[PDB]
Amino acid sequence: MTELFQELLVEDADEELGWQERALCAQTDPESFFPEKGGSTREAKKVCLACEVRSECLEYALQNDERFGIWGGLSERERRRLKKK
Template structure:
């Protein structure tokens, strides 16, 4: 899977801390950035491929505007 889309990702202009908060932190600002990002769908697809059916506790960060909890739920619904 190509990751060429990352060059156009808005998160690359901000830095990773917003997208990978400390335990107990929130994802709101990251999700706001993702909502405007032109490569949001490619990002979400990349997370799905790399995380597969991983347990929620093995997922971290915002990908494609989705939190680890959201991505876990989406994976279950897709199965």
């Protein structure tokens, strides 16, 4: 349908700062990614599943070692066990 022939051939920016700009969650409620009280961690996991820079997000999160929120489709203890493994 309205796919623009996979981004088409009309582009003038020819400039990218980094993989932040390709983040899908930026098009989405930030609050849902930090479940307070008990919360849930599956809808935002589904959102991350379709992210095109999931690997980069996971790598950056692990390298900087944030212990809050859900990054790369994984929550805190998945990151912790991956770090410990």
